[PDB]
Write an enzyme that holds these catalytic residues in place. Sequence first.
Site, PDB file in Angstrom:
ATOM      1  N   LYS A 199      -8.983   2.885  -1.465  1.00  0.00           N
ATOM      2  CA  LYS A 199      -8.422   3.050  -0.125  1.00  0.00           C
ATOM      3  C   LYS A 199      -8.708   4.434   0.450  1.00  0.00           C
ATOM      4  CE  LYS A 199      -4.719  -0.132  -1.357  1.00  0.00           C
ATOM      5  NZ  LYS A 199      -3.257  -0.391  -1.355  1.00  0.00           N
ATOM      6  N   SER A 215       3.443   0.495   3.060  1.00  0.00           N
ATOM      7  CA  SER A 215       4.717  -0.156   2.763  1.00  0.00           C
ATOM      8  C   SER A 215       5.531   0.594   1.704  1.00  0.00           C
ATOM      9  CB  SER A 215       4.477  -1.597   2.310  1.00  0.00           C
ATOM     10  OG  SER A 215       3.538  -1.649   1.247  1.00  0.00           O
ATOM     11  N   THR A 255       0.848  -1.229   0.000  1.00  0.00           N
ATOM     12  CA  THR A 255       0.000   0.000   0.000  1.00  0.00           C
ATOM     13  C   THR A 255       0.866   1.255   0.000  1.00  0.00           C
ATOM     14  OG1 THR A 255      -1.926  -1.026   1.069  1.00  0.00           O
ATOM     15  CG2 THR A 255      -1.700   1.356   1.322  1.00  0.00           C
ATOM     16  N   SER A 256       0.465   2.229  -0.809  1.00  0.00           N
ATOM     17  CA  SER A 256       1.091   3.540  -0.832  1.00  0.00           C
ATOM     18  C   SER A 256      -0.005   4.586  -0.725  1.00  0.00           C
ATOM     19  CB  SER A 256       1.881   3.735  -2.124  1.00  0.00           C
ATOM     20  OG  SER A 256       2.884   2.745  -2.251  1.00  0.00           O
TER      21      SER A 256
END
EC number: 3.4.25.1
Lengths: 226, 232, 222, 195, 195, 212, 125, 204, 196, 196
Positions: free
Chosen positions: I33, I129, I1-2
Amino acid sequence: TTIVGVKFNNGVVIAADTRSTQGPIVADKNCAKLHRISPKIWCAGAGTAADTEAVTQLIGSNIELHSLYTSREPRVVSALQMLKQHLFKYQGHIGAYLIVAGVDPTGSHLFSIHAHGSTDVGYYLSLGSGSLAAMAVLESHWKQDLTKEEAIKLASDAIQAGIWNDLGSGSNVDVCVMEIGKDAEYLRNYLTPNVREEKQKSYKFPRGTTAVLKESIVNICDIQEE
Amino acid sequence: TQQPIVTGTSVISMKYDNGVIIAADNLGSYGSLLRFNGVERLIPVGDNTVVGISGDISDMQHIERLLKDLVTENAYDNPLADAEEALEPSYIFEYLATVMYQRRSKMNPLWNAIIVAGVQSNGDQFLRYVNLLGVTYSSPTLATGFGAHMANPLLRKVVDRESDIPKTTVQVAEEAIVNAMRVLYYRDARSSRNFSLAIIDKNTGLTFKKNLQVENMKWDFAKDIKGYGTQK
Amino acid sequence: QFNPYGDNGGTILGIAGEDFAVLAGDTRNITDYSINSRYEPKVFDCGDNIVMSANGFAADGDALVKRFKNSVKWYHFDHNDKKLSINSAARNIQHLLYGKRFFPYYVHTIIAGLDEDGKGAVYSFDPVGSYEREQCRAGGAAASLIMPFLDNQVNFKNQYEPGTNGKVKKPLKYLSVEEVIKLVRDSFTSATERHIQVGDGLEILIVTKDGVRKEFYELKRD
Amino acid sequence: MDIILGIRVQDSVILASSKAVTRGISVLKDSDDKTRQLSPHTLMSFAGEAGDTVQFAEYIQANIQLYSIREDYELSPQAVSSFVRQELAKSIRSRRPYQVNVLIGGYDKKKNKPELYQIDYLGTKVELPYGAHGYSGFYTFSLLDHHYRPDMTTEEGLDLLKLCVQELEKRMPMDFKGVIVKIVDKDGIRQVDDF
Amino acid sequence: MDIILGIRVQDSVILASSKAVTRGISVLKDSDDKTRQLSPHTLMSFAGEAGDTVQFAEYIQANIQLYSIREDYELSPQAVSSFVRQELAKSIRSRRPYQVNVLIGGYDKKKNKPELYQIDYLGTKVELPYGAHGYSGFYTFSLLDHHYRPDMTTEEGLDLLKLCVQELEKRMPMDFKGVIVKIVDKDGIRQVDDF
Amino acid sequence: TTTLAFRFQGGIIVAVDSRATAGNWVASQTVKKVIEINPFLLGTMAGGAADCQFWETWLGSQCRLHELREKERISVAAASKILSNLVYQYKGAGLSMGTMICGYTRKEGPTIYYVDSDGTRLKGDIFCVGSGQTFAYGVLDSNYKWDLSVEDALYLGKRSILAAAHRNAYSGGSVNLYHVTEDGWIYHGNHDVGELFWKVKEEEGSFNNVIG
Amino acid sequence: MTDRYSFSLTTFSPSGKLGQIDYALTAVKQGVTSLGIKATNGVVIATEKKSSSPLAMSETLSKVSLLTPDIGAVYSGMGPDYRVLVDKSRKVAHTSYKRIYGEYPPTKLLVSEVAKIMQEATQSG
Amino acid sequence: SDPSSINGGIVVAMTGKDCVAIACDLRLGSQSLGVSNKFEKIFHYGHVFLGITGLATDVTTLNEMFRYKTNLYKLKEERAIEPETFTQLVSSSLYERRFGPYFVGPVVAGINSKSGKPFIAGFDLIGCIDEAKDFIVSGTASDQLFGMCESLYEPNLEPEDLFETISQALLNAADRDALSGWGAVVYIIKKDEVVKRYLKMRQD
Amino acid sequence: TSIMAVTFKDGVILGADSRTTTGAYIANRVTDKLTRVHDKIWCCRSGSAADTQAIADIVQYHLELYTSQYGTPSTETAASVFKELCYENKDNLTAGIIVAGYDDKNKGEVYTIPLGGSVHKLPYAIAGSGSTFIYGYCDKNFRENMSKEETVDFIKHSLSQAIKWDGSSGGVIRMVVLTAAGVERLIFYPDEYEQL
Amino acid sequence: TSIMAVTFKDGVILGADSRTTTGAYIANRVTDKLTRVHDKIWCCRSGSAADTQAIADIVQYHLELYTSQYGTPSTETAASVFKELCYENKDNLTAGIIVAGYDDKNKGEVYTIPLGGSVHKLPYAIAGSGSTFIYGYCDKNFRENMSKEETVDFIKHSLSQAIKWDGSSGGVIRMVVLTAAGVERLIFYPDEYEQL
Ligand SMILES: [Mg+2]
Ligand SMILES: [Mg+2]
Ligand SMILES: [Mg+2]
Ligand SMILES: [Mg+2]
């Protein structure tokens, strides 16, 4: 287990294989994995089979009471919210992985839900041990604005990919089509590509083959008069 | 006993009427870090064989050197090194399979899954798999890692059994391979868009294609997807 | 931690007739829930009218068969092209297996052929080389599904003659090669229905005084 | 505790139970009576974890005595054994289960029949002609399987019991310091003081 | 193996060793002689891990017999005990150590003295008036500490030994099936066939 | 598994069951648990099947080499010790063996040695080894005499295996009998436990607990 | 706070009458007429929709209610009391039957459950 | 250690033409030790039959529980419970112990008294229903039973033919399982007569 | 995930990739998200999908009930409710949430709530991450009071690099713009951001 | 540790921080991580200090013996010797080494040898714990054929960010320039690079 859900023009279709296993042994060769939450909200379950069945019937029961209380037809988002909050509370110990699909006054819906309580939205979804085989087919042939006939074809092809390539999946394809402004049509054993061939030999025994020690009539009737 | 450090993902392959096709992406992953983006994981041996390797890259480079040395060694005192006594795909595979099984038997494996694709002297298609355990098998389609789960189902729809092989052209086979690579890019978190593809044909020989890209991708439908349930 | 072993599934079946022997096996090769190959031969003609299969971990299986075939070749070199009898092959395989007693070939080995009197012979081995001559032996994944059926239909276990009610057993009449092949096919068809690792194809090697013959049959591919 | 044996003969039930109490290194006692009279015609022997055995046995005794007073009636051996089984079946899913195995020897005055029930700590009940708990059955059952008859007298039952104890004393590594033997019949419960 | 006792009296050394051989569940033998004659006036009893005990004892026996033939001379009990200690001290740092405890009872013909040596599997040697290995000392040493005298006769030594065995038979949980008793004196080694 | 061997007036009786199990699964009912080392020596199989088979066959090769070199029958003492010394070398490696080496020579008479994979070597009159050993011991101990006839001794061994086969889940299939004499062992047949049980029940009056 | 009425509000009078039950029956007597008739191949239940005002949409007020797919109910007396009983009756059909036996309760047993609820309001605190 | 294989035992059920059959072995053991050869694993509540394999204490407890519940059912419903309804009751009862389950493998068999339709069902230890048309198996020799049933079974067998098929399925499966055997019982169930037969088998 | 949220002149913009992985398998390549807890208070979710969805739903409920009683909540208030849930249940949660919102009084605000349940008010925040690989880039390239177009470019370029290096990140770049003008959703596809 | 090597027009430059930690304690704040194995072949060391020193010393010996026999070794040859030691002893080593060198024929070359003992020829390479934070920055800012001054700025800015975010990195920024002109050492202090 292979289960898929596919959105189309005027609704949604859900499909599943019919093999239930205990380890490497096939318990039931014609299992029914497509379950009814409400008349037009159906779902398919992978993981712990008792949990998928139990959680469906519990939410299906509460959905029915909610429908009667509100004098409104049940919504997919309600089934979804009730399922996820129940599953989240049990922190993944209820091993229910579901694809939930249906139609309601709001429209047609397709969701997946995982044992820990996370949910996802999509136009096409797959679940179970054969999900990668199924998703390969879906990612190859899915397009926007599918017709009812194209969606049924795509969904069953995705299940077939699981049936042939995943050892955890097999036997038949079950399908349920939920179209807006129509009764949901459950198509049990929509495909039957795995009928066993005739055996080489009959194994019917001659009568009196088995050795017997005692015989007796079992009284299944109640206590009698007179 | 070790653990793989820098790794390559799926290798995928299939037979067609006149030969074999093999493909693998150009990524060298370092765990979840997509560290190296120009790694060639298809290694040709002569003009009749291509060895596709997944798993540990340091071991891949060692195997690459073994194959290079094998060609040198075969040419020694061999007047027919470029003719009747050239290396066959079957010789190259059996050698690798021997090494892989020996190394696992010393509890010091080459941490790889390998597919040897090629065409034999008599024109027969060769396609066989070997891995870190020394396990070997052959099939009309072969794939490693994620490819086994996602590519094989798609490739098996083209060639489902032995009798489908003569009915499958190089255009249909390549098309299926390229689509499978796109599907793997959608769904494998350790894949890249860039890949290499090699065709070994009994008539046209070895065609090695570098710098290929996954194209014709569907993403537009993402715009309509909102929230995770109730959000509009 | 590195696990040097794996499980490639598969099921094999050896049956010894009066003047013949069959060694059958499915052609499916698997890891976990994936199919590696729908046709990967598992039963091999090793020369000298001996057929062999080493079921379980395929790498160890292939290694053992390869070393035994090699042992047949060197037996000919060392002993003036003498035919390796099935009993001598069986003892030889015991030593091949026991040689790796403390790092075993993770396989269940069965060989079939004819003894020196021309009678059907099947030998069965555990992973470390304990062996026995047997009339009937299934090996591998669906062995527990097949053996009880063979006890009942080959040896007529629990079957008595009608009218006597347990007093007289059903007599053990000899089965033809056609009769054995029927039981083999039905064994594998049933195993295919109830065991996920069994399917795709059935290859049977039949051994007689005339030599080794092969028969192939399709099994369900799901 | 260690060895508890039971045998149901023609007109009585005989229970034999070892006398030793061992706490690790030392034998603390060699005259321990591993039994409780639940009712005039029902006797229960027991073996298992220290403390729990006696605690469980006396708890059962207290409950059966309570029932006897309330109803002015003696429960049948079958009824007592079912009550005991339920308590153990309840116990096995408790926070800390009773680790106790029991034999229940009783004489049913209604049916005029001796009855022997074997119940383990899980609540596994079986009615048997002869029974044991632990390793006792491993040494004794082959002898009982050979010699036992349903029409045996009490004296023949005692002789077969002696043979079982002799085999135990020969092949068992542990010294269990002999057995106390009790007989349950129509006249009630009595102890054989020389064995 | 289990109980091995030793007592050095005025003119002899007495070794008592249990007869039982137990392999887990069953007592396989009840007449096992846990001793080896190393030389005409030197006896070694032993207890420890199965197999290693006899293997070690016979290995020592073979070596002492070899020395006796080479030199035409019997080594002193002290010399034999030192040889045995070194072998065990060597063994404890080996790949797989001998798990064997021994008592060495000998009569020194030069000094005209009985001698008892206690050596454990580590190579821990001590010369004692009386000794034991395992748990045997826990039950017997209080009796030996009370009654022992250096001027005891062989008959008095045997009587004190009987009291020790009786206490073992009373308080030890394991049935060791009695003991074989052997006496080492100026005339050599002999077995007491009634004990 | 249940194996026994006992010395008596007429030599040695060796009796074994025939069942091999892998967990709850019954792998075989036709296992040969008596190993015919040579025409004069027998060994019993318990623990590891391969370990027993391999090393007791090997023992036969060593016994043959001995009598070629020494021009004399090997003693049971010497034969058993060759095996026990061999397994003792392997101690710790994980061999599994519990066997009775049985023979009858001039100098020794009928002799039985219990040999075991942790190095134990015990001479004795009666031995029982395996999961069903405790059941067989009961029948043996209560009926054994030195002055048994060959006929009665054979039956006693058969009856003792039957006792174990009945009660112990991992014992059964069939009973193999051997009688060891000075001139060699004599095989006394294979006896299916299923048929034997009913036969013994009726003729003997035993197993009244079981309905037949 | 806390509900400190832990005692019965319905009690026997000297004559043996349970006053509150009699008065509840009086309230039923004042209620609008409803009826039920059983036929060989069906049952009918009916009542009057006594609209409190012509501006009120009497379709939104359901006097006849589905309890299960095969069971229906009508009332006479206090409407609000009926409405909550219908809610409880629908739920108890699931909790004490359908979630146990996987099928809807037979009429007599659902009636028995509703009856039990009404009995408890006659004795509970 | 594994609770489902301490005591051992097996149950098998089959459907035939206007009939059902349910059978079980009679063994109860403590691992290797045989304890009882009279431990019947089939029970009945009215005309509905229930076989239960697994941990013997739970077998006994569940029988007592379902007798309890079917007796109250009958008093309130004024009729005997049917196989379909009882199956749901077993499933519900098992699942209510989801995180502390009875270690059992139940098998329901019976004929619906109104429709006359033969019915069988199986469950895992937490209540998941297996409603097979052909056969249901349970116990420590379930693999063996699956093998026997898959080959021996054919549809629409007459009561006396079905008896032979199910008997041979049980017997030969049991003889390949250490923890099963020591006798066997077979119930042949028709709409208004039930016959119970004890089989002769090897006692090892 | 960014994921990231960046304040700028006219308000705040939230950014996120769309990849959700189960090990190396991409379970969802088009995940959203960017989650709405109030009209102009949104959040970026990282960590356990079950946890962050559960938390976001509870927060949305709290702010809905807050609004009915006390009117529109501040972004600070929303962050406080998030923090309360994350901090008090820290033993049983794996949630890294960035809260972003627009007031008229306070304008654009960003709060980051890492694993422990602490709160940090920042001009911009990065998490997930993939954020590890862009700490250098974002620190060098962020300016205060950027324009809408500049902020979109900053987020697009940042998440492009995070996606490029992090296998757990990928798919489309979603963005939500929060200003006085309203709420605007943006989406950017691989063919666009990969060539940057 | 933060280390990098960057090829440019006139050759190659190696860069490194100077922090060596034992847990959270800085055991050496002025470490020299730029290690000479030949006149114009140097290396940057990361991982076990014992391992990378041992390896570098062995390589230096090998190249010294190579030179005496065969003349000046290529940078590729030096990388091969490093790889041989790292690959063959992978079970007992924790070493991440970047090899950088200048030939006249080949000019500036960079090879990175990560944990497994693989070799990767690259235009530039980054490694060490601090490198994670500058993957985005370095990828966006690196150009081929930069000038000496540009390459120094690129490395200075890159390692500045790595130092800023990584607690295991810090101290001074050391650099070694490899060109035809010779070998130049550079050093940059905190007061210089922190204000960038
Ligand atoms: Mg199958
Ligand atoms: Mg048995
Ligand atoms: Mg059995
Ligand atoms: Mg990515």
